[PDB]
Design a protein around this ligand. Structure first.
Ligand SMILES: COc1cccc2[nH]ccc12
Lengths: 412, 412
């Protein structure tokens, strides 16, 4: 019979910091993590900036010998996972190791490593491909390497649902616990797509902002002068735990995960429908799953990518789901500051949604200077808004018309 | 309680055939699909052979223009999915489309596309990268494109658990239906890693058989002369359906999906533990999920990759789980004929497990000329074995120590 699921630990690498508290301080202060990319020569690229993780030290987590074998997206996923497990206070024992699993996903996975090995292959021959190429690059190896390091023998898997990955990963890990396949899951996502193929490939789709001369203002969700998403790196991980398991060990509980929705648009490979029909269907599923009145929703962490079609589709979906209550809730895009962490977006944004509940504050949508036609909700323009938040919703929408919604509420 | 899940449609591309009946005819005849890889200079490579899909015509499924946008692994996944939906007879309507979802996965995803776009990037720079590079290469686009083409609005996602992908996709899709989130799911996996990067990547780890002189004899699970797995391409898709839904429309039911097990080894990144402790937990989890005693199992489709460590771990696991029944069941590796389809292995082997139930026959382990030390189970050496099969297991054990088991039962 369906059990309740709470959040007992969180971990993060973002363009705003090397952990949760440092990231959250940047969020509440309206700070941009977006800057010209230093790690490669992008003079031939139409976009030369993004949200980099600054000063990441993998040797806070892993031996340099093991780190060298792993794509950055695996290193970021392990860092957030280790932080979340530590933050939980959970002790892994022979008694509980079979009941603790992991679902850390990625949208694109080890593109940097795949590019570097493709260069070796093409310039020098197959004998120069790394022996660690496959286990060092494939998406499931966050879950794999975390289980090996911590001794987690529960369900072990990874989702890849493009920009919806971190939201789906957390929702499905919550379903694992809810229906008794696990008592604890580490769940979230990680992404490092800032290589030639990543910036070049999104560039070739003309999906990215090209505001190279003012990167901190590039990400401007619902602003009339927005011109596409800002590519960002990092990771979010949460420890999800069955309520009575958490209560039994005296865990600190940040919030309860009460609702999860999925829906497919069945509309277009990359474009969202302008009326937000799939996102509305996904939110309604999530609110019904949480047994809520839609009027209980106080805060929405929007997908809010800063694309022309995506941002307006979300306003349409929120108006359609919430009717007059759409004018009472606060909705913000933290991508205004972090940029778009792709498969990690829904993981970091789930964490920001939990902290909005802990601290009773709506994070701002920075850069919202001139809201576009129809973008007339409370979008928390410019500055953080202290307010009552009992229920918070986090939305993600990705390529393939794939939608995810998570519903969190305060736990007393 | 929980709804029952049945299989009403199946679809496949494999090295044996461009559909299920052709593939299955090859399986029961002990035919190898392994041959030197064509239209590709493998001179500098230690492995020059594998399981290719032969004579695949994508214009049976897609326009030339839509096919040009999509990696081969996506093409293969869509072909299996379209076959499976056709085979099921299901009519998608406005009344059921929100209850029909997709979970089609891949282990490695778009290596061929990444490789071809690397060529362009290194030679000519980023402005030659295809606009469809990202959506045409990411793993969730089989689910994406299938949902868009057929108007499916149910749960839309993609698993990526390396060589466990197909088994986990089908199992979690079955959970979706059992727990009322969907009435129908298309589930399985696809793979096309026969590029420089895949042959090169696995070859650099010396994981592949190098028996270039006799490719049809390379894949020889539990044989003392085995020297690693054989890389293979293709796809499997199953239509999963709630039982009352299938009966109401007069669906042809192949078999019932009664159990799903997951575990993590938490042991090593690429190698299983010698005693198969993880594979044992996973099978026991699957049988407990099915409410079945190990004694009720009649047929196991092994993971059976032809690796020294992998094959012996599976013998140890089966002896551990099944005790005095270990010899009574039949266990075969269809990878002896198909090679190792990686993320699609669990999908095509779920189909062969269902057809073993339909036709009351254990497929052979071909090339099992000299069983290794302790390989003394009924491994169905050389030739198919007609026998009673009421309960059939399909196991996958992949990188990161990720395990999956599906339990299928005869339906009457
Ligand atoms: C039991 O585990 C699950 C995995 C995936 C999806 C699910 N929905 C309801 C339960 C469930």
């Amino acid at each position: 019979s369906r059990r309740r699921v709470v959040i007992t630990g969180m971990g993060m690498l973002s363009p705003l910091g090397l952990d949760v508290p440092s990231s959250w301080e940047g969020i509440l202060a309206g700070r941009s993590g977006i800057a010209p990319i230093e790690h490669m020569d992008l003079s031939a690229y139409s976009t030369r900036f993004g949200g980099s993780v600054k000063g990441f030290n993998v040797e806070e987590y892993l031996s340099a010998k093991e780190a060298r074998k792993l794509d950055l997206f695996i290193q970021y996923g392990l860092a957030a996972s280790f932080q979340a497990v530590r933050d939980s206070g959970l002790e892994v024992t022979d008694a509980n190791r079979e009941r603790i699993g992991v679902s850390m996903g990625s949208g694109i996975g080890g593109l940097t490593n795949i590019e570097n090995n493709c260069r070796s292959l093409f310039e020098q021959g197959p004998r120069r491909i790394s022996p660690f190429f496959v286990p060092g690059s494939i998406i499931n190896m966050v879950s794999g390497f975390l289980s090996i390091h911590l001794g987690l023998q529960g369900p072990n898997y990874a989702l890849t649902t493009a920009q919806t990955t971190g939201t789906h990963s957390i929702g499905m890990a919550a379903r694992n616990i809810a229906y008794g396949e696990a008592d604890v899951m580490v769940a979230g996502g990680s992404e490092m797509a800032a290589c030639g193929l990543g910036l070049g490939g999104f560039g070739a789709a003309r999906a990215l902002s090209t505001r190279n001369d003012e990167p901190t203002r590039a990400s401007r969700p619902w602003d009339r002068d927005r011109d596409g998403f800002v590519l960002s790196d990092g990771s979010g991980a949460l420890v999800l735990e069955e309520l009575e398991h958490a209560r039994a060990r005296g865990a600190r509980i940040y919030a309860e995960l009460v609702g999860f929705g999925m829906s497919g648009d069945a509309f277009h490979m990359t474009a969202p429908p302008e009326d937000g029909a799939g996102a509305a269907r996904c939110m309604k599923n999530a609110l019904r799953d949480a047994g809520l009145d839609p009027r209980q929703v106080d805060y929405i962490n929007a997908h809010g990518t800063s694309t022309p079609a995506g941002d307006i589709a979300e306003i349409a979906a929120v108006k359609s789901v919430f009717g007059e209550h759409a004018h009472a809730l606060s909705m913000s895009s933290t991508k205004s500051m972090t940029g778009h962490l792709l498969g990690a977006a829904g993981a970091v944004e789930a964490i920001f949604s939990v902290l909005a509940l802990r601290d009773q504050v709506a994070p701002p949508t920075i850069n919202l200077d001139n809201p576009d036609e129809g973008c007339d909700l409370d979008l928390v323009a410019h500055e953080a808004k202290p307010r009552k938040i009992d229920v918070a919703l986090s939305n993600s929408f990705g390529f393939g018309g794939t939608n995810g919604t998570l519903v969190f509420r305060r736990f007393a």
